[PDB]
Each structure stands twice: as structure tokens, then as C-alpha cells.
Design a binder for this molecule. Structure first.
Ligand SMILES: O=c1ccn([C@@H]2O[C@H](COP(=O)(O)OP(=O)(O)O[C@H]3O[C@H](CO)[C@H](O)[C@H](O)[C@H]3F)[C@@H](O)[C@H]2O)c(=O)[nH]1
Ligand SMILES: O=c1ccn([C@@H]2O[C@H](COP(=O)(O)OP(=O)(O)O[C@H]3O[C@H](CO)[C@H](O)[C@H](O)[C@H]3F)[C@@H](O)[C@H]2O)c(=O)[nH]1
Ligand SMILES: [Mn+2]
Ligand SMILES: [Mn+2]
Lengths: 278, 281
């Protein structure tokens, strides 16, 4: 029974978009009250889940740093469960988790093409959601492993379906977005359409919503295959297609997934997470 | 939650179902897990479980303990396995099922198995204060050299839980292997004692467990200073503690049976059995 005006103050960040045309809030540094939210959610005793895939050298190269920084910055003060999906479990790093953090490892099959490794995540996530995640967490996030938290990534990011603004295009106009522009693809988005360009490196919401998101993207990914076509940015193309039809209830600013390669403009006040120098 | 709701001793008349201080003794057939699961589910309670594996005990019992726990321990409720080992690279990563999760901790290995056993008391406490108190409603501390044979459910939860030792549940208190030397802190005089509790399983709410582990380690340290060591180590201190601070619930030998004894008519359904320690032939 939480109201937007209870934790969100868009007037703190007037230079950027704080609200979508459909009433969905865009969380920027300085517009949220994590103190209120932490109290409100704690009273509900919610549990947050976080899925992550590490296949191949992505394990030695990123998994440890991802987990160590997540244990340190992800929803601090609230129960968290990390679902590690790897192809070689005996290579997974067992870091020491802090208060309210626990994990669970799953051995998955490694896809030959790196593209399928990225896209197959959609199918796997849905299977685990149905199998157990829906019964263990109230909110779930699905992130890339080649990222690193730099600061608090709190409950101010929770919602039915949360989307992340892609660092490079958050200020570009829709007609410039790198959407899949070929009608033969299930991810096809016609010019003159589109709200924002979402990053597939971070997305989430309630187990139910994430299931629909992952289920719908996988279908489209599968359909393109039978049609011998592949979305330009793979699952990200499908994810953007999905968020167009089913708009998110909340969007995270590029501060929750910044690419230091871009530099650090005025708009980026406090980076919560950054891309790895892959 | 009233005892009348789930507990019914009329089902097992041949055995003690109630202590003198009114604590119940859970036996197969006297509990209604169905009702308790409902009450406990609505409460959104999470159950914790500590376990230690140092040296050879990792390869010989850790994997079997967790696999059987993941399958039988508090099924249908959130559970967090707390694994303490001296060598993490040997930690066997088994696939956990719905409502289970865990985290491993690297602990310093002691040079005397007796110290490994007794130190668990100190380590468990430090972890209760550090994080366990903030993650679970009930916690269980078990030996690793055992395996779950069947459902070990919420019918075992309570403020402070004690396990009856399979070999003496029918023995005379004066035959118990309590520490009989008055120079030891674990000392229990002849003519005193209710039951002989198995240190292999014990639990309760984090707070209670913290007190149990704190008081036992204190006794252990005091003995080290008086150059004396309880004949049954931490188990001796635990019995002494459970004598002074009687538990709110007790588990029949069915929750921790030794097949070497065979299988008398009292053990209706084994929930957990001891793992063998040596290959005798
Ligand atoms: O060899 C690999 C390749 C990929 N991955 C997994 O797939 C994710 C995405 O792959 P990349 O990081 O290589 O892709 P990129 O940084 O280009 O990411 C963007 O584009 C991808 C599709 O190309 C996805 O949509 C992704 O979510 C989006 F952030 C990784 O984080 C990782 O969890 C592996 O585990 N091993
Ligand atoms: O080399 C060892 C020896 C012991 N332990 C740990 O200490 C526990 C207790 O040791 P044992 O199982 O070897 O002892 P035992 O079966 O004789 O157990 C009884 O006596 C013990 C003290 O001797 C404890 O009180 C214990 O709880 C009680 F059940 C083990 O399960 C294990 O978790 C190890 O990890 N490595
Ligand atoms: Mn990436
Ligand atoms: Mn033992």
C-alpha cells in the first residue's frame, strides 16, 4: 500500500526524464527515499532473487567480482538469493557471503555459439522460475555477469516489471534506437514507434512478470530461428520489442548500469553499477 | 499454536511422550506435520541448519548429509544450510531444490578432533550474532556424520530442542555417561539428570541456541584452565546445560538412530541414522 509520492521526488532531478508518458517512474540518483522503502519492504519481509550466468571464461573473468560486489551492494538489509548458472560448477568461486545473503548453484549446458548462450538464458530463467524461484522470492532481477556494482542498488528499483535504460542511447530519439527494423523478425519495431532503448543487461520484477518477459522473448527467438533470421542485438532486440507492447512499471536510469567508456556526464550523479572492461 | 493442535501422545503409549516439566517428546505417529506446516507457512518462517566438515569428514559425510537434508529437512519451508569447512576447494556443490539455499564459511582446522567438535560451539555463536539471528526463526546444529532417512519436519521446531541419545533412551540416569568428575564444569552428580542428550542434534530459536553454545564453550574453556577435559567433550557440557535449562521439546531416537543397535519396536520410522565411522568388515 505504498504511494509514489511516498518515496519518489522527481523535482530533485529536473534536467532528466523522471516520468514516462504512461505514468511509470524513472529512478535517478537523488529522487528516491531508500529509507522509507527499506522500512516499508522490511515490514513485508520480502526476499529478492538475482539470476546470473557464467559460461566459459566468463566464470574466471567476471563471476567472482560480480558476486563479491553484489553481496556488498545488492538490496542491503534485505534477504537475497543468488542463483548461479554455470557450465563448470567445479570452477565456480565460493566467496564468503554476508548477512542476509545466500546462494544456489546450477549446472547448465554450454551453447556453442556465444549468441545462443546469451539468448538461451531466457528459457533457463523461465524454467527455474516455474520450478522454484516463484516460491522463494517476491522480486527477481536478471543481470549480465560482466558488470560490477559500485554502490547501493537498493529496493528503490523494485516493481512489477523493471527495465534498465541503455547508457549509450538514453538521450537519443526513438527513430535512432538500434531496434530490429526487419519485419521478418519477431523483435521487429517499426520506425515512428518506441519509448526507450532498454539494456538487456538488467531487467526484473515479480516472478510472474519476469516469466512472461522471458517466455515471450524466447518464443520470438525461437520463431526467428525457424525463419532463418536473427535479431540484430539478439535477446536485447526481443526484450525491447516486449517492453514496447508490455510497458514496464519502472525504469532505472543509466546510473544503475553505466559505461565508464562513455565518460561521466552531468546526468550521471552516482553510479550504482558499471560495465566491465571486456 | 496450542500443543493440542498437533501433539497427541495417545498414539505412542509404550514410550514417554511428556517430560515432567511438560516438554513433549516427539515420536513417529504422535505428530501432525500437516497442521504445523500450515501454521508455520503462514508465519513465513525460515529454518537454518549448521554443519561442520573438517578433514576426512568432508569427503566421507558432507555430500551425503546435504543431499539427504535438501530432500528431507523442513520440506515446504525456506531453509539455509550453513556449511563450515577447513578446505573450501573440497566443498561438494550439490544441486539444491525448492526452498533451499546456502553459503560456505572457511574455518580454521583444529589439531585435535576433540577440539574440532568442541569449537563448533564457539563458531556457531559468532555466526548467530553476526548473521544467523537476522536470517532464521529456528536453527538446528547437527553432526555431519549422519544422513536423513525420511521427513525431519517442522514438528521438531521449538524454543530449545534436544535429541535423545539412541543408546540410553531407556537407561537409568545413574548409568548415563555424564561427566562425573566435580573438577569439570560439565559435572553432573549421581542421582541427577533427566535424559542423556545426543550432541549430534540440537537447536531452537537463534537466541536460545546462542545461549546453549555460549554456556557450553564457557564450560569447555574453564576446563582447559583446570587442565581437565570432559569425557564426552561438548556433549558432556550440553547435557549439563540441558539439565539446568531444560529444553522445550525433545526428539525420540527416531530422529537420530544408530542401526548398530538394530531396530527395536520403539523405532517406528527413522528420520535420520548415524553414518559409520570405520570399516570393520
Ligand atoms: O561466452 C559467453 C558469452 C556470454 N555469456 C553470458 O551472456 C551475457 C551477455 O553476453 P555479453 O556480455 O557477451 O554481451 P553484451 O555485453 O554485448 O550484452 C548485451 O547484448 C547481449 C546480446 O548480444 C544481451 O542482450 C545482454 O543482456 C546485453 F547486455 C553475459 O553477461 C554472460 O552472462 C557467458 O556466460 N559466456
Ligand atoms: O575429524 C573431524 C572430527 C570431527 N568433526 C566434526 O565434529 C562432529 C562431532 O565429531 P564426531 O562425529 O566424530 O563425534 P561422535 O559421533 O563421537 O559424536 C558425539 O560426541 C562428540 C564429542 O566427542 C560431539 O559431542 C557430538 O556432537 C556427539 F554426537 C562431526 O560430526 C564433525 O562435524 C570434523 O569435522 N572432522
Ligand atoms: Mn554484458
Ligand atoms: Mn557424530
Amino acid at each position: 500500500k505504498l504511494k509514489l509520492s511516498d518515496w519518489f521526488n522527481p523535482f530533485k532531478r529536473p534536467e532528466v526524464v523522471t516520468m514516462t508518458k504512461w505514468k511509470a517512474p524513472v529512478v535517478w540518483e537523488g529522487t528516491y527515499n531508500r529509507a522509507v522503502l527499506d522500512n516499508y519492504y522490511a515490514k513485508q519481509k520480502i526476499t529478492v532473487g538475482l539470476t546470473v550466468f557464467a559460461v566459459g571464461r566468463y566464470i574466471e573473468h567476471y563471476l567472482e567480482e560480480f558476486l563479491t560486489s553484489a553481496n556488498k551492494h545488492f538490496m542491503v538489509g534485505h534477504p537475497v538469493i543468488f542463483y548461479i548458472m554455470v557450465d563448470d560448477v567445479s570452477r565456480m568461486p565460493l566467496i564468503e557471503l554476508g548477512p542476509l545473503r545466500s546462494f544456489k548453484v546450477f549446472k547448465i549446458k554450454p551453447e556453442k555459439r556465444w549468441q545462443d548462450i546469451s539468448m538461451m538464458r531466457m528459457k533457463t530463467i523461465g524454467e527455474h522460475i516455474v520450478a522454484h524461484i516463484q516460491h522463494e522470492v517476491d522480486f527477481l532481477f536478471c543481470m549480465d555477469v560482466d558488470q560490477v556494482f559500485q554502490d547501493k542498488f537498493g529496493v528503490e528499483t523494485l516493481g512489477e516489471s523493471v527495465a534498465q535504460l541503455q547508457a549509450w542511447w538514453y538521450k537519443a530519439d526513438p527513430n535512432d534506437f538500434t531496434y530490429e527494423r526487419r519485419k521478418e523478425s519477431a523483435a521487429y519495431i517499426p520506425f515512428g514507434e518506441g519509448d526507450f532503448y532498454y539494456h538487456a543487461a538488467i531487467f526484473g520484477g515479480t516472478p510472474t512478470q519476469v516469466l512472461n518477459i522471458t517466455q515471450e522473448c524466447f518464443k520470438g527467438i525461437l520463431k526467428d530461428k525457424k525463419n532463418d533470421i536473427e535479431a540484430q542485438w539478439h535477446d536485447e532486440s526481443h526484450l525491447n520489442k516486449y517492453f514496447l507492447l508490455n510497458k514496464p512499471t519502472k525504469i532505472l536510469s543509466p546510473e544503475y548500469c553505466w559505461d565508464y567508456h562513455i565518460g561521466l556526464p552531468a546526468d550521471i550523479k552516482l553510479v550504482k553499477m558499471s560495465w566491465q572492461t571486456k
